[PDB]
Amino acid sequence: SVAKTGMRDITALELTKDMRLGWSLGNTMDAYYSAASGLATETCWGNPKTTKAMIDKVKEAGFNTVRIPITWAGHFGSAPNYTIDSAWLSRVEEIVNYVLDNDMYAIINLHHEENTWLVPTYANQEVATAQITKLWEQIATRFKDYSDYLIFEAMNEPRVVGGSAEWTGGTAENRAVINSLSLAAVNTIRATGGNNEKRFLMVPTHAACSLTDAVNDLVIPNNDSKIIVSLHMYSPYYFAMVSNSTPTWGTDSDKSSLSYELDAVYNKFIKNGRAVVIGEFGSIDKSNLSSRVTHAQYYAQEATKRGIPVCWWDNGYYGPGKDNSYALLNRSSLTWYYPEIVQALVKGSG
Template identity: 45%
Template sequence: MKSRIFKKSNNLKLIIIGVSALFVFLSSCGQSNETPTIKDPIPVQDLQPDLPTATVDSSMHGIGEARDITSFELVAEMGVGWNLGNSFDVVSKDKTDWGNPLPNKAIIDAVSEMGFKTLRIPVTWEWNQSAIAPYQIELNYLERIKKIIDYGLENQMHVIIDLHHDNEWAKPIPSLAVNVNKRLHSLWTQVATYFKEYNESLIFEVMNEPRIKNIPQEWTGGTLEGRNIINDYLKTSVDAIRATGGNNAKRHLMIPTWAASTSPDAMNGLVIPNNDPKIIISLHSYFPYLFALEGQGTWGSAQDKADLRAEFDKIRQKWIVEEKRPVILGEWATKKTIAVKNRIEYAAFYAKEATARDLLTILWDDGGDYQLFNRNTLTWTSVEQAETIIKNAVK
């Protein structure tokens, strides 16, 4: 995705990450798990913008009373997914700024017809939400997002919406934390209220890759202070959603680690808000980094496969086995610069091995560097790769 170009693409950053990973490992041995959390109450009376509820067709799939099922049961139903990347998540009012056409029904229909069962819609709110209390979200923006959700539901898909590139205001640093909590509380109260009539087929992912940008630990698990502030942001968001009642009392929610990282510091530092039973762990695993995200070299040796299996085993052991929480790998991909044959081989192995470990995969497709579906021509960059993912993501 466009943001991935400027956030993860230079050699200097790789050097910094390697050094910082060693530092984090050495320093974490003596870390305490106790850090202060943000305890200022949210002044609800100051955060009450207009709270419209979407008008819906009660006969449509995804509308009506939510079933009281477990998150494991929901994830088992969902099926392999596809990301509508670089659309609603564009950091501009103009959602075509990163080269894709505006999302439309033809795009979602084509993705569904290929066999993808879950639609993830990354959403950046900053350009369509007031930065001051009561942090009103533009109604027409909610309406635009609703249309795409409905196209997914009409295709019998599960749909995920998130808070994506809102990193400039939602930074996990102490000086901003009180105001960030207020804005998150208002944002998710508005979103949850608007989509209250949607049942468990709609999932809220309360943050995407929360982190402090451009610090040495940005992609290696962050800082203890930052991780604890993120935990507080997650709790604020979950509490706001649950407080709206109705289907939102039973809605399944996704929460990420620091930067959605699979590093030990990030995964061990995540605290489940209120030990909520309907929480799904959201992780991103572009693995191995140099091949999958940077498009360097080739992949497929016995060691390459063993390393990727070990990555999946680590995730499964931590969350599914030990913590009894389902996992969604909300982003994975390979660059278009990689030979198509190698992309297909990697995709087949990734989808098969993740699925074998009950890890639901959602392919990142930005319509650009990581394109699999060309939204301008409504054609697949590689039909064989898409079909390979679908085939291998079924047990």
């Protein structure tokens, strides 16, 4: 286990290079139903209750990072304390230890918070600041003594859900409020003791997008050297995410468009000494395995050459021709639906 190996003398760029290739436990601790569901949210989107044996298979395949997306909304109480349900926090800790016991990196975040409370407007800034502070105070305190293999991702895809700028990079107001929220979260985490003064932290742009105005307006809290930028880049959009559209990938235009997107991130952040994790990418199943393999290998290869680790979104949803069919692992048989994609990712990562 790497749970109690402490804090190395290491830079963020060095750490992200070692993170290498990641896998998110998607549609699991991030799934939601209602305030009545409690611990049953984990299984409400069709993933069996997580076991260490599932994580063992991820390690065995060659991944070196597991991201554990967690929706806290539905599991915390009223203002002003926003107390997190003790059983929920204990369940998160069990899963964190499945990952660290496999000698891998673990990322924990706040996930689908934007639908209720994480609304980045000037009007809501005071309330959202108090709330993100109270939540991270509790989460960071619980995880304070873990080693540098545990990373905190402060927010997921902060944005005003339903508004016109949701997928266009936000408004300037939205981006300023997000910077205020990440500053409050980082300052809260750093003040909680244990190893949290030294822990590596991930901070997203608006909606974790790579659009120019979103990447340019991101402010690293305190210019802290242990902050990593979090981007979600399901690139290119139609091939990766949209059913009944664009089932092929692999032309020179396709490759150069993806290299351009990754060059933009490399030139903006990596070459300027700022580490980046692409915390989500992937492709849905359009009965197009050969294109998905070519895309996975090229994405991982070109990101690795630029010092950027990538994390596949494995939501456990299987469905050729269906929306959001990103599954790679069958968590019940403990066998892979698409070992060819896994092999392409691991090979591309080096």
